Design an enzyme around this catalytic site. Structure first.
Site, PDB file in Angstrom:
ATOM      1  N   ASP A   1       6.848   1.278   1.491  1.00  0.00           N
ATOM      2  CA  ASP A   1       6.589   0.284   0.449  1.00  0.00           C
ATOM      3  C   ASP A   1       7.397   0.603  -0.807  1.00  0.00           C
ATOM      4  OD1 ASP A   1       4.024   0.998   2.073  1.00  0.00           O
ATOM      5  OD2 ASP A   1       3.605  -1.028   1.453  1.00  0.00           O
TER       6      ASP A   1
ATOM      7  N   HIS B   1      10.119   0.480   7.380  1.00  0.00           N
ATOM      8  CA  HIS B   1       9.705  -0.849   7.812  1.00  0.00           C
ATOM      9  C   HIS B   1       9.683  -1.848   6.659  1.00  0.00           C
ATOM     10  CE1 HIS B   1       8.278   1.250  11.466  1.00  0.00           C
ATOM     11  NE2 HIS B   1       7.974   2.197  10.597  1.00  0.00           N
ATOM     12  N   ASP B   2       8.816  -1.622   5.677  1.00  0.00           N
ATOM     13  CA  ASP B   2       8.557  -2.627   4.653  1.00  0.00           C
ATOM     14  C   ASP B   2       9.765  -3.269   3.949  1.00  0.00           C
ATOM     15  OD1 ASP B   2       6.121  -1.895   5.518  1.00  0.00           O
ATOM     16  OD2 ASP B   2       5.455  -0.988   3.629  1.00  0.00           O
TER      17      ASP B   2
ATOM     18  N   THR C   1       3.231  -6.200   2.631  1.00  0.00           N
ATOM     19  CA  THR C   1       3.691  -5.074   3.435  1.00  0.00           C
ATOM     20  C   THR C   1       2.584  -4.050   3.682  1.00  0.00           C
ATOM     21  OG1 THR C   1       4.493  -3.844   1.513  1.00  0.00           O
ATOM     22  CG2 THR C   1       5.994  -5.462   2.508  1.00  0.00           C
TER      23      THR C   1
ATOM     24  N   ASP D   1       0.847  -1.205   0.000  1.00  0.00           N
ATOM     25  CA  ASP D   1       0.000   0.000   0.000  1.00  0.00           C
ATOM     26  C   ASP D   1       0.877   1.249   0.000  1.00  0.00           C
ATOM     27  OD1 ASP D   1       0.978  -0.462   2.589  1.00  0.00           O
ATOM     28  OD2 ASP D   1      -0.841   0.368   3.604  1.00  0.00           O
TER      29      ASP D   1
ATOM     30  N   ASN E   1      -4.194   2.954   5.041  1.00  0.00           N
ATOM     31  CA  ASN E   1      -4.484   4.275   5.589  1.00  0.00           C
ATOM     32  C   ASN E   1      -4.856   5.248   4.474  1.00  0.00           C
ATOM     33  OD1 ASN E   1      -1.732   4.081   4.440  1.00  0.00           O
ATOM     34  ND2 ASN E   1      -1.270   6.114   5.470  1.00  0.00           N
TER      35      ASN E   1
ATOM     36  N   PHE F   1      -0.012  -1.044  12.511  1.00  0.00           N
ATOM     37  CA  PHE F   1      -0.981  -0.538  11.541  1.00  0.00           C
ATOM     38  C   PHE F   1      -1.490  -1.621  10.604  1.00  0.00           C
ATOM     39  CE2 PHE F   1       1.002   3.653  12.462  1.00  0.00           C
ATOM     40  CZ  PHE F   1      -0.134   4.277  12.850  1.00  0.00           C
ATOM     41  N   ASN F   2      -0.576  -2.384   9.995  1.00  0.00           N
ATOM     42  CA  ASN F   2      -1.011  -3.308   8.949  1.00  0.00           C
ATOM     43  C   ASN F   2      -1.978  -4.345   9.481  1.00  0.00           C
ATOM     44  OD1 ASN F   2       0.391  -2.016   7.017  1.00  0.00           O
ATOM     45  ND2 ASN F   2       2.093  -3.488   6.948  1.00  0.00           N
TER      46      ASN F   2
HETATM   47 CA   LIG Z   1       3.112  -0.520   3.852  1.00  0.00          CA
END
Ligand SMILES: [Ca+2]
Ligand SMILES: [Ca+2]
Ligand SMILES: [Ca+2]
Ligand SMILES: [Ca+2]
Ligand SMILES: [Ca+2]
Ligand SMILES: [Cl-]
Ligand SMILES: [Cl-]
Lengths: 308, 306, 304, 305
Positions: free
Chosen positions: C14, C230-231, C116, C9, C38, C157-158
């Site tokens: 990402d 993160h991803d 992700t 996303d 989001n 979040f994910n």
């Molecule tokens: Ca993501």
């Protein structure tokens, strides 16, 4: 007479219950205990002393109980910012406030009287009863039974499915409904039938006494609440009436438990009407009111009280 | 006629609904799609092919759908209710997953002409909604057998079709399409009394005998759940499509409980006043008993002996 | 190379994950599939096509997936503008169907799913075609957090945006590596790292720096830390599993709790089970991770 | 000395907490109150009187409390493998623990009594709801219970909170100051062979009592361990004695009541920005040598009573 403890949060209908329990000779009021509800404990306790003054209740301890529900936050479009409509309070109460917490008073009374002689009649949130059960577990088998006004197996008011007294302290209701004592749930499915119709109101007035007047004053503050789309239903005295004469309503023996977790249903009294029905069940629910007998009991109690 | 997609899990109730849809002149079955429930997807798909064989249902794709509910997990019976399966079914299984068949039919037919009639868990319906959101506005309406506003069977307050996949029910009930909930409050009235079963028996055809045999099997299996005669559930939803005066309805908000300790799967209907003026959900209330059984017996008569 | 499907996303982190997957030779990107998070599905799908344009990714279908989570409710990228027309075309297939088609058409145990974003597409694919579960090699996702939350005190979040979808994914029998916040909070975009990114000197590097500057502003404002990426950590694990340590422990998803819905509940108690299909990432090899990211940017170069 | 009420469910950990409170000069035990837990209220009350006898604790009321949690359902001899005496020297106060707690707090000056719960929080919660004035009157609460990143009763819940989540929710949502000494701290209070030998060398009956029972329960509960046996409850008493024995962090802490997997979890919000005001804090790192020095010192000061 049948000895009762009336645990309430007055509240216009709690007031009518106090009148019924006092004026009717088949029940003996041993105490009026108060609990936080949809008015603060302080306010309902002031209201209980006011009702006791108006009915001239002497020799009956009035004890204030829990100021907060067990777990939930505290929760007045029904009974007024006062809890008792638009009535004028006296400068001074005749009715003194007992020095004991209601929870201790309930325990003391149950443990000092002979087993199976006291019926608990809660008509507010169940916080005090649950506290007493957990602080002194011996009260459970010593109590005759519990007849509470609360719940609704197929009707809600506080939510689509929950009734106010259970909704304001679900954990306390869960405690009360899962002890082994016999419980009669006089819920909204029953009490929506206790209609203070114009005819009934005129009979209330024909008593011509200060308590009847007090009652109809608070009751049409109540009536204008319930219009804004039925007549005022006077719930709480229904529970007292059942103790006076169980033929005033039909009941059905079914399992009843209290929902504590659900997003849409917390506070619901979940009644199991599936088959087979239990042949032994410590809970029963009230179903159909005998309207004429019920209002006859209320008016007879007002007459007996007279003008103290 | 009203075009329908019958999404089901036969099930004697679903079998009677299939017979009613196929025999009645006012319904056009576009597909029979199957879904997991308290019976496995594979078992009810075998049953659906047996029912289609017995009724002579040709030209109607039978498609297997979801093998598992969305989130929730989860004897002595020959064939269906002691009616053996044939060595091979005449009715073939469509190659498509039910979810895809539902999407394809809805998207290829003109808008507002197809009524979805679910009579099992709502998993295929909810999957189709999330995979192809355009189906929601394209569907005429949804008429489901499931739920119970003041009744339960899976639990004191939940009905099997909603209880076995509450999440899928929550999806179906919270889309904007019109939903008629034909719940246990209604279907408890569809009693297969001795007089009704005598009229069924007198139809005198193999589908009528099949229905009575399987109903008897299940009447005995679930004897402990009743205080009176066997009822049929699922055909009530088909009957509503055939003739909506067969039952009364009330428009009321309905939501699905997902996280109650005691109430998960409950269809929570808000009957409090004031009732909202515009509700996309309605619940079925009172059955026209004679009309309902007249339709069922008429469908059996019209099917005859294929 | 390890064939992967990158379900995302975008999203700046990402974007970095897409760059890493495309630039590193140990992985072969089979598709980029998008999912609501989001930002709306439409928005992150535009962002994915932008990122594919920037990196010159050709021959890799970009497919839009689920517009809504399963059950729960919900001026180009950062400050980069969109071109008037993308070079990267939007695939015609729904991402869920593309995922199924790829898995069923390739030999068993050759594709790794790398989610992700929210897990909605993965969960839908699982329920629509259960045969994909045994056919997939494993799932390496960026999501969750066994002792860390951001969306709530305990939820990431994910997972938080679609707990039911996460529950579906974590309760299938396939092997799952959870690259959660406990790991990715270590993937810090420090000033030295950002200088090395600047010094790659390509238009994709400058794109990543511009959007991560937009990201550093919000991480300083809302979390009092440097930007963490993160991803790409999940992609990094498929490239080289020694880039992080893992622990094999049971993990399940809380769906009901008033305080903990969305939490990835990991059971670190003893005794551990002998057969556990889930593992959680713990400690990042910082230098190796950022080396891999920089090397991929240098390999992409200034693309065709 | 800092006055405490030790509300407990002995329990070998609680026994060591009692020994530590009785032997250390910085604390004064006002009462030992008992609460149902994994063992019945009756049983842990017999255990408390046993511990009080062994330690020679006189002049400290021992009072039995709640027999059931608020809402949730519920070679050993006496305690571990120690048999009870024919009659206890230590007598039971006749008051319910909940009433003793209220009486002590209401009769002493404000802000002088620290509550130290090391069992389920049922008595504390009941006292709060029966006499709300106790909440502002208590100096603070230091409880052994909870686990912000660690569980034992479940993957994420600790036994004391798990056995009565509702009572924990009551105690954690009052306005008083709470220090949660949870499993993240206590899993560090290891009773290594070095420590055990030092305890043995104290050479008293309480020391042998502690070692014998701890050994019993270490064998019974050793597949649930990856290392040596741990003591939990005395760590809360240690904090009252010397707060520098462990580090703390002020963070919001709430109790999950309706989770499918997480009921009973102490949910600690470590996210930034940290809040303006926090009335709760969690313990993080233990001073291992100072903790065990304090335990062994209390055992030496008690002697053979
Ligand atoms: Ca993501
Ligand atoms: Ca009341
Ligand atoms: Ca069915
Ligand atoms: Ca002492
Ligand atoms: Ca303990
Ligand atoms: Cl491979
Ligand atoms: Cl770890």
């Amino acid at each position: 007479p049948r000895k009762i403890i009336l645990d309430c949060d007055p509240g216009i209908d709690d007031a009518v219950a106090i009148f019924l329990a006092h004026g009717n000779p088949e029940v003996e009021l041993l105490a009026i205990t108060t609990v936080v509800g949809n008015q603060t404990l302080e306010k309902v306790t002031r209201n209980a002393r006011l009702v006791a003054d108006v009915a001239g209740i002497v020799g009956v301890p009035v004890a204030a109980g829990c100021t907060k529900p067990l777990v939930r936050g505290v929760r007045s479009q029904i009974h007024g910012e006062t809890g008792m409509g638009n009535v004028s309070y006296p400068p001074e109460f005749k009715t003194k406030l007992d020095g004991r917490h209601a929870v201790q008073l309930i325990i003391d009374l149950i443990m000092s009287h002979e087993p199976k002689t006291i019926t608990l009649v809660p008509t507010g949130g169940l916080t005090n009863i649950a506290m007493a059960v957990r602080l002194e577990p011996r009260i459970v088998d010593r109590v005759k039974e519990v007849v509470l006004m609360g719940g609704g197996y197929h009707t809600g008011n506080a939510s689509p499915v929950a009734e106010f007294n259970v909704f304001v302290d679900p954990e306390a209701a869960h405690i009360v409904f899962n002890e082994s004592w016999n419980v009669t749930m006089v819920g909204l499915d029953l009490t929506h039938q206790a209609l203070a119709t114009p005819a009934v109101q005129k009979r209330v007035k024909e008593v011509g006494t200060k308590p009847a007047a007090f009652m109809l004053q608070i009751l049409d503050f109540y009536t204008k609440v319930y219009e804004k789309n039925t007549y005022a239903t006077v719930h709480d005295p229904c529970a007292v009436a059942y103790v006076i004469d169980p033929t005033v309503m039909t009941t059905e023996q079914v399992p009843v438990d209290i929902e504590l977790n659900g997003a849409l249903t917390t506070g619901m009294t979940v009644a199991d009407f599936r088959y087979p029905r239990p042949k032994h069940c410590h809970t029963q629910v009230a179903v159909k009111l005998d309207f004429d007998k019920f209002w006859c009991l209320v008016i007879d109690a007002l007459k007996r009280i007279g003008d103290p």
